[PDB]
């Protein structure tokens, strides 16, 4: 009653049935923050895949990103793109944005902890969104 | 359609009616992580005030704390106290644990952003829990 159980750390996301793979809320690189704020408050999801003109994931926009925008001492309005969050961090280049179904729980957990991020986008071979894995999903696997 | 509106940044938490002040789920410094994990998965709250023998807040235990525990390369079981999370960070000493009803939205937002934390415990004059303010609560105020 090692924590975490080693037999479950060696299992893939697919095997453990971890994540959300239906009804994914997401936005574009051309999406203004007002759109994302409306989603967060009315639709009630914790983070949003940000996809480019090809449908490929280039960022994740979270509730903390909005608060960080709100603390900026320079003047902003809500017509700023969600891509201005990229001035504060690059999940993409740090390799802490995406994951695959075949990756192990141990791998996914290490990636989350690596940059202190609360979610990863599950993608396909073309970096197109298949689903999302958040700490809540991991916790259900850790029990 | 400065974001955030200055007239709302200068208002207190009390004035804006921001936070949860009823039915707060919390744990003790003597609480094992298995207890917190059960709360997170079954009760479905995002973070837990950690209070000492006097009922004073000494930490907040979050879902990320469990994942961080799970990534530790040393051997753990679930009978570790929630206070082992304190090896990774001290919200208390950094002044990013607590807040008051009379503090401004601007103050609260800056504190969140200061340590990249997603919540603060609202306390009284004796550091006893009155409520909790999370990014979701702030977002409802930012609209
Ligand atoms: N953008 C999203 N669209 C749909 N479901 C999501 C999204 N972001 C997170 N979820 C799911 O919401 C549930 C709760 O996650 P969390 O809000 O982090 O506790 C999890 O099962 C996530 O996979
Ligand atoms: N330990 C807790 N007990 C009760 N409510 C909480 C607790 N932690 C967070 N909340 C509330 O849960 C709601 C959603 O917060 P969050 O899960 O961060 O999106 C907010 O109104 C928080 O104040």
């Amino acid at each position: 009653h090692e924590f975490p159980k080693p037999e479950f750390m060696s299992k893939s996301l697919e095997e453990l049935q971890i994540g959300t793979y239906a009804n994914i809320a997401m936005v574009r690189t051309t999406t203004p923050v007002y759109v994302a704020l409306g989603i967060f408050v009315q639709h009630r999801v914790s983070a949003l895949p940000v996809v480019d003109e090809k449908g490929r994931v280039v960022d994740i926009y979270s509730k903390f990103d909005v608060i960080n925008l709100a603390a900026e001492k320079t003047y902003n309005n809500l017509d700023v793109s969600v891509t201005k969050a990229l001035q504060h961090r690059s999940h993409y280049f740090e390799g802490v944005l995406k994951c695959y179904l075949h990756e192990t729980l141990e791998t996914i957990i290490n990636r989350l902890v690596e940059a202190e991020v609360h979610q990863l986008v599950v993608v396909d071979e073309n970096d197109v969104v298949k689903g999302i894995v958040s700490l809540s999903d991991i916790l259900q696997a850790l029990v």
Side-chain angles (χ1 to χ4, degrees), chain A residues 20 23-25 45-49 132 134 136-137:
Chain A
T20 300
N23 301 342
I24 301 288
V45 287
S46 61
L48 299 154
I132 177 152
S134 78
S136 295
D137 302 317

Side-chain angles (χ1 to χ4, degrees), chain A residues 18-19 46-48 60-65 89 91 96-97 99 108-121 132-139:
Chain A
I18 296 166
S46 61
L48 299 154
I60 291 156
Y61 198 83
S62 67
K63 292 179 174 177
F64 182 78
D65 289 329
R89 77 288 179 288
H91 300 311
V96 296
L97 178 50
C99 70
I108 297 305
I109 288 174
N110 287 338
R111 185 171 302 148
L112 292 169
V113 166
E114 207 173 356
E116 308 187 294
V117 296
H118 291 209
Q119 61 275 132
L120 300 158
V121 188
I132 177 152
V133 178
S134 78
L135 307 181
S136 295
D137 302 317
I138 299 280
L139 288 183

Side-chain angles (χ1 to χ4, degrees), chain A residues 11-19 21 99-105 108 120 122 133 138:
Chain A
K11 291 180 193 303
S12 72
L13 286 174
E14 189 150 2
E15 292 173 315
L16 289 165
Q17 303 198 287
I18 296 166
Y21 301 95
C99 70
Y100 303 115
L101 285 169
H102 63 262
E103 296 189 294
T104 63
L105 181 64
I108 297 305
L120 300 158
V122 188
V133 178
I138 299 280

Side-chain angles (χ1 to χ4, degrees), chain A residues 33 37 40 59-78 80-91 115-117:
Chain A
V33 169
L37 183 51
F40 288 141
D59 202 25
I60 291 156
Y61 198 83
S62 67
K63 292 179 174 177
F64 182 78
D65 289 329
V66 178
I67 299 316
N68 213 7
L69 178 63
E72 285 176 26
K73 310 231 171 291
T74 47
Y75 181 97
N76 302 295
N77 56 49
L78 274 170
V80 73
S81 266
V82 293
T83 50
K84 217 178 77 94
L86 294 171
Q87 85 182 36
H88 296 295
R89 77 288 179 288
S90 177
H91 300 311
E116 308 187 294
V117 296

Side-chain angles (χ1 to χ4, degrees), chain A residues 18-37:
Chain A
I18 296 166
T20 300
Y21 301 95
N23 301 342
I24 301 288
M26 58 193 65
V27 302
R28 289 272 348 265
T29 52
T30 55
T31 301
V33 169
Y34 64 79
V35 173
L37 183 51

